[PDB]
């Protein structure tokens, strides 16, 4: 059902965005990276104590 061996090099996933060299606005990253962004938005929780 599956064929080639694992690579051991642990290549990180590679990206090419539509953003310009000097983009600094957080909202500009939301369209291309909604999962990381939604996770970033979890930093808003300001009620929980340890």
């Amino acid at each position: 059902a599956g064929c080639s061996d694992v690579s051991t090099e642990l290549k990180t996933p590679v990206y090419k965005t539509k953003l310009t060299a000097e983009e600094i606005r957080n909202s500009a990253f939301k369209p291309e990276f909604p999962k990381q962004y939604a996770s970033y938005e979890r930093n808003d929780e300001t009620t929980v104590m340890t």
Binding site: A1, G2, C3, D5, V6, T8, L10
Partner: protein, 145 residues
Amino acid sequence: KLVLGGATLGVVALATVAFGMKYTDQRPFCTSCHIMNPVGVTHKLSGHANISCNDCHAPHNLLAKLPFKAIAGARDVYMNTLGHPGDLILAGMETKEVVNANCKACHTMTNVEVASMEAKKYCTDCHRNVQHMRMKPISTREVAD
């Protein structure tokens, strides 16, 4: 001559089941699901790189192994398709007990004069990194999907 054609079915139907059983014991087959490649990377990096996954993960005994592989394959296919695996993937009691029995199958002679099964429940309570190098930094094992 319809016996020499039926005996050629039986020695190609067992040669296929035999080859297919060994293939689905192995790293390229197991790591064909991307959820399995941290264990695959850590297997290939380890002292056990050149033994198959099922040399540890399934019973060696053939009457025990066939049902096990099928049941384990069924639930792994279900979890990868209709299930929702969590952030932590951990082995069950069933697989902790088969892995451990396989440690003893290949390493009896190191351990014959000593009560190494008595203090620690599992061999890997001392040989911790045989459990997929779990104490090493995450980046040596893991990348984003």
